[PDB]
Amino acid sequence: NGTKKVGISGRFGARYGSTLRKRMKKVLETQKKTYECRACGKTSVKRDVVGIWTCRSCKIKFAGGAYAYVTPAGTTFNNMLKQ
């Protein structure tokens, strides 16, 4: 609450530039977020390794992207298989 527009990138302090800290705020928001489990339906999916997403309740691992749970190039190739 204490920060006006920096957000999660306030740990870096007053270094590395201005636009380098903008690029950190996009990625670090989607990494630390928790998501819904596709199997059990609960919101407990977290990331622990690059490319591995696992749930706390049902304990089932999912493959995925580096920093997001789903990839924008990953979802377009699901639509063309549905037709």
Partner: protein, 232 residues
Amino acid sequence: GKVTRKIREETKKLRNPRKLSSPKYPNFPETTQGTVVDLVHERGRGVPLAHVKFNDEIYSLIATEGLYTGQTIFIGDNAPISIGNITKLKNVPGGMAVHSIEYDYEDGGCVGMTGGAYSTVVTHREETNETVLGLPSGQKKIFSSEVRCIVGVPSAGGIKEKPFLKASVAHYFNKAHCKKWPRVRCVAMNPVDHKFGGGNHQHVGRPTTISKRRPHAQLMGLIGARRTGRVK
């Protein structure tokens, strides 16, 4: 002079070369069914591997995009095409994404190994039984059919989004990948160690474009360039 850095790095690779996995899938005559067991992580590479189980035998494979533990996949020359299945090349329609292509039949796999990089199919030619693929590098290569491949985009996403904002982040990258880091520019060196070295100011004094005609120890700089500079 002395032996420079480039030749001294290659002979350091003969004393202790780098080690990786090279994962390949088996060959089976008819369509079988297998189950995904677990997902792991290796030292050098970024893309996670997967352990599948065909006929009570556990192999290793590159994980596709949507894959969870306990799912069932099929392997064969005539399997149905969906996410994670492995079929022949002639069955897939034009426009999809495949990520392990063997050059010849009954081989493990050659093309599309890393994470985030995929290829596309552009056509089929019923005369001479050939299909043209679109490589990730951007070049159209003509492939013979009857090779088998896996359907889908590989995992691990776009790693190149966030930068190494610190120097310490790039230290652990090059150390795991067995490369030399940090690197010193060749202008700072004395003229024993490198051809560009020495002088009163830091400058080159020689043209940096070097032909490929010359012998192996003379190759440095931009080797055999067709063009140099910003286009626009």
